[PDB]
Design a protein around this nucleic acid. Structure first.
Ligand SMILES: [Zn+2]
Lengths: 98, 81, 24, 129, 149, 139
RNA sequence: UUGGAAUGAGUACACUUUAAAUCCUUUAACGAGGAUCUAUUGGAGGGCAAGUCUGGUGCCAGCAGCCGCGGUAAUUCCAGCUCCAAUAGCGUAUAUUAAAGUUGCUGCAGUUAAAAAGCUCGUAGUUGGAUCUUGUUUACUUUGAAAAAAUUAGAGUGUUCCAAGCAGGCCGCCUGGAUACUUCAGCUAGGAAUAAUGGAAUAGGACUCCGGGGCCAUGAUUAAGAGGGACGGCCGGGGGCAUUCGUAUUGUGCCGCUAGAGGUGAAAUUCUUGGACCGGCGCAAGACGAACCAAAGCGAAAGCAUUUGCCAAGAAUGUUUUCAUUAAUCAAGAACGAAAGUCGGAGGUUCGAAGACGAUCAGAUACCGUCGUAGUUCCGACCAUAAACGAUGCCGACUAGCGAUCCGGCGGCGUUAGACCCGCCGAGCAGCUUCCGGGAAACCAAAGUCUUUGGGUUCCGGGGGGAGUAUGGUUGCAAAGCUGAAACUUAAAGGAA
RNA sequence: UCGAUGGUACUUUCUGCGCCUACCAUGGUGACCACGGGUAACGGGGAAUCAGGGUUCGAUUCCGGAGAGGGAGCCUGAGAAAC
């Protein structure tokens, strides 16, 4: 049975796409089939932002961030629980969670 | 719309349709007399000219070829019948 | 598996050919 | 490519009747179509159709009466005789009480009843009921 | 759709219903024929002559002003090319691709596209021979194809 | 789809001609095979000499001993294994006696839980096995 | 239960029958109550009409086309009884037809059940727009002849009825021994719609003059929401070559400070007895082209992403340009066709089949780790196979709506210095809502317009195995590609839910 | 080669004809399936089964052909390659 209309990838009217490597296991995954996640986090987390700010040499220095674009294969994205299996009707929801 | 009149369509919808899909196909193009400000002779040029037309005497350039209706120069008339 | 069965078949064709060329 | 014009003419009518349309626009017209629509009109299956001249193949806007169940073509146009005409009446017509099989005979285009009264066979164009 | 392409475009000129010369066109039938001749002697093809007449001369259609077409007008005066223009441009394009394919033997797209162009050459020439436009001994060979152009 | 043309008779006739061979029933009865491999050679019955009495295990889930006889055909020398149909009729079949065997009911197919026996005994010693089972004939 | 009746089988005095007989028919005599003058053949779980009956047997013997029955209360076997079916017939085996719309013209299928070639070109083949009197060449249709009888259909006729026969009515006498069908091709006489073909274009044109004249309305249908070609401004990770940049990885020179670094679930193999790892300035080589990068673009698919230049192509759009059916799909044939693989060169940074070693395990010849050959890279020549997938041929028409998006074009407030905003048209990749409809359903605006079945056309499927095997041919350096069986075995295999 | 196709002249036959001979010509057939192979293939009128369409069968009393164990060659006669 065809489980998904897009076959699990965002490829339409296109023959081949260049692959990438999953961050957990370096395996060849198509760029559209990859479960991407652009994570923007601070270099200093909230548990340590107090000590770093009070020990700074500047009056007002904002801590930088880590702009990392993570890529995941289907298998590792589910073991890492970044995507869950949804109901047969809930799968059709293409909106990101709030 | 089960009883839409196909024999008597409104003129606002026939101009909307493609020039081939109309009830009777008719061009969306036309001719026009271009009067340059330098000379007095008027030249009958096509709207979708696609060539570089010139006035009699090589006074100036009338229009320029484009992907659609030709782009006229400054100070010219058009829309003849 | 249908692919390893296909591989066992081609490994068997290659043996039947060499056994046939010996008595050729 | 459009290898048969009577096919696309009757297909547009059959689909417009299924949608409850009042009028249908047959884009390509021909002599066979106008005489086919006339056979359907003489028996009351369609209304008055207006041929549109555009210095080309021409278009027709047929007025649908809602009395037509299905009109279709028979491709290719087989050669039909008088002894073989009853065979097509059992395969195409829905009953022996109504429905007609249009034939193109040397005497002109007519249904199977008029072709039998004139006692002349020919080729089969289509059917309607 | 296209003959050797998956495109199904509809772009094409749609002639008006009125097969009549407009009242504002003063050029007579003979005045247009003189313009066709002077443009044919300049090297313009029948498809190019009708463009200049359409733009710089207001002649929307010479088949409505004059009783015949451009190619028939040039044939009467003997100013028509030996081979037709549509076949001349199919051979010209095939020579341009084959010339490019000599100094570039690694583009298998131009090699595939050359088969398409020469397919339309042999299709079109087959039609002109049935209409006796080309002699029965005529043949398109890639060797002397550059000489016909 | 299919070709519906006025001059497509040869195309349709040749297509059906070559597609009928994909039908295993038509191909079986239109080639040299399955007729020479058939021990009867196209006959409904055949006579043979009983080589030995053999018991054939009934296939699962059933469990029994099918009383059969290894028969050598007289017409071509082929050795087949018939089946003594009725209850206890194996005792009526002597050794090296001529018996008339026929198909088991299906065209070259094994009938019932018997593995490969596709024949059955009809007569024995020129006496029908049904007459010996009912006591109306002897020997 | 009791009775008299009636009769054929049988039987013969004989006739008849026939060349002579027999048979049938006719008919004396004779011939029926257990009218013993005896109806069998297959079945009684279901399909399939008919037993919860009794006894025996106890997964035994056997039944059973199929599904199944039997392991100690068998409705299925061996039997009694009873019942059912056809009936002087009834079973069995095999071939064959219908069933089978499971061979398809009528009339099937190919998204997932078996299935559409990886993709495109292309000959034959098949099929091809509209248009010409409305108000030569053929095909086609109609008519006649022909198509031997017998058979078949069928008219007449009490062979006692009937299958048959062609004979037989009537009180010499008058009636039959008909007709229809016989494909295709050929022959004939009408029809002229539909579908092909021809006529005048360098006029060596028709009709008239009577080599030159006159004359004809003097001879070219349309310009496809078919196609080719030109042209216009564009557009695209389309292709090729040549340049160019980027950081990274590995290696290396120098400098710095240090004993650990690498790796793992945990470790070890390994790198460091010192200068590994780390930091700095560099350098060299070979790959690769991040983020931007999307259910976006392009290309026939495979496939395609740094810059710049060059080369020749391409769709779409625009067109009151040109040609005028040149078209569609395609046996044969042909171009291209990921990766891996093969051969010959160059190069081998990374990665890494094989291989080694270190872990884990009962064992790992695996997963995991440290290396590492071929390979991965480039050039030329092969290979031609992928879950080459949208598991869905191509062309064309039609049948809903909506918001977006890519390209081109078009006209409209306004903002900005083309960008944005609002619509429309054509082209395309998609999305969604719908009781359009379809389907076994999942699902599908096509997988719809399908028992209300026929637009054109190619390839291809026929239970599951055997088996893409055997053999033959062909292709290749090879690996293997293409074509491709049968014996035999099996009652399911499988799809969706 | 040693007739395949055609032309010319014979020869021969009951006659036309590469039927045959001699001299020339290089043809003739084929994906519209030639050639080759198989047929448990005599052909047909017909039979069975069939809503239509079909499928299958036709050694078998009628017609035509063929053969008389296998080939081949002849006699006689109007007529036979006869059993
Ligand atoms: Zn992963």
């Amino acid at each position: 049975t065809k489980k998904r209309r897009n076959n699990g990838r965002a490829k339409k009217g296109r023959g081949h796409v260049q692959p990438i490597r999953c961050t957990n296991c370096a395996r060849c995954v198509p760029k559209d089939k990859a479960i991407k996640k652009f994570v923007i986090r601070n270099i200093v987390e909230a548990a340590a932002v107090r000590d770093i700010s009070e020990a700074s040499v500047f009056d007002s220095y904002a801590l930088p961030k880590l702009y990392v674009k993570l890529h995941y294969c289907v298998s590792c994205a589910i073991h890492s629980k970044v995507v869950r299996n949804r109901s047969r009707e809930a799968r059709k929801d293409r909106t990101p969670p709030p | 719309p089960l009883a839409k009149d196909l024999l008597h369509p409104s003129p606002e919808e026939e101009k909307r349709k493609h020039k081939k899909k109309r009830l009777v196909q008719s061009p969306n193009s036309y001719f026009m007399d271009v009067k340059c400000p330098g000379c007095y002779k008027i030249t009958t040029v096509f709207s979708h000219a696609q060539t570089v037309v010139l006035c009699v005497g090589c006074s100036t350039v009338l229009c320029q070829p484009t992907g659609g209706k030709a782009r006229l120069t400054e100070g010219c008339s058009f829309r003849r019948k | 598996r249908a692919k390893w069965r296909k591989k066992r078949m081609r490994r068997l064709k290659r043996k039947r050919r060499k056994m046939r060329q010996r008595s050729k | 490519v459009r290898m048969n014009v009577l096919a696309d003419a009757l297909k547009s009518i059959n689909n417009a009747e299924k949608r409850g349309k009042r009028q249908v626009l047959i884009r390509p017209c021909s002599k066979v179509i106008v005489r086919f629509l006339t056979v359907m009109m003489k028996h009351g299956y369609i209304g008055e159709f207006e041929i549109i001249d555009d210095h080309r193949a021409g278009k027709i806007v047929v007025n649908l009466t809602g009395r037509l169940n299905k009109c279709g073509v028979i491709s290719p146009r087989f050669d039909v005789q008088l002894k073989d005409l009853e065979k097509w009446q059992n395969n195409l017509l829905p009953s022996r009480q109504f429905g007609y099989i249009v034939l193109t005979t040397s005497a002109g285009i007519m249904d199977h009843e008029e072709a039998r009264r004139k006692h002349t066979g020919g080729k089969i164009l289509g059917f309607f009921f | 759709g296209r003959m050797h392409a998956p495109g199904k475009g509809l772009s094409q000129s749609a002639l008006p219903y009125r097969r009549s010369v407009p009242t504002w066109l003063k050029l007579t039938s003979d005045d247009v024929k003189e313009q066709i001749y002077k443009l044919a002697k300049k090297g313009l093809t029948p498809s190019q002559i009708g463009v200049i007449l359409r733009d710089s001369h207001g002649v929307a259609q010479v088949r409505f002003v004059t009783g015949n077409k451009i190619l028939r007008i040039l044939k009467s005066k003997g100013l028509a090319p030996d081979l037709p223009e549509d076949l001349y441009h199919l051979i010209k394009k095939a020579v341009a691709v084959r010339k490019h394919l000599e100094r570039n033997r690694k583009d298998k797209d131009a090699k595939f596209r050359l088969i398409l162009i020469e397919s339309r050459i042999h299709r079109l020439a087959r039609y002109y021979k049935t209409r006796r436009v080309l002699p029965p001994n005529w043949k398109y060979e890639s060797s002397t194809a550059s000489a016909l152009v | 789809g299919k070709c519906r043309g006025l001059r497509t008779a040869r195309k349709l006739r040749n297509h059906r001609r070559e597609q009928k061979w994909h039908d295993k029933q038509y191909k079986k009865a239109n080639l040299g095979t399955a007729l020479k491999a058939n021990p009867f050679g196209g006959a409904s019955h055949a006579k043979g000499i009983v080589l030995e009495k053999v018991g054939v295990e009934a296939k699962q889930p059933n469990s029994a001993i099918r009383k059969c006889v290894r028969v050598q055909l007289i017409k071509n020398g082929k050795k087949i294994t018939a089946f003594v149909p009725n209850d206890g009729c194996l005792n009526f079949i002597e050794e090296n006696d001529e018996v008339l065997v026929a198909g088991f009911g299906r065209a070259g197919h094994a009938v019932g839980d018997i593995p490969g026996v596709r024949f059955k005994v009809v007569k024995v010693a020129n006496v029908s096995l049904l007459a010996l089972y009912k006591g109306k004939k002897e020997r």
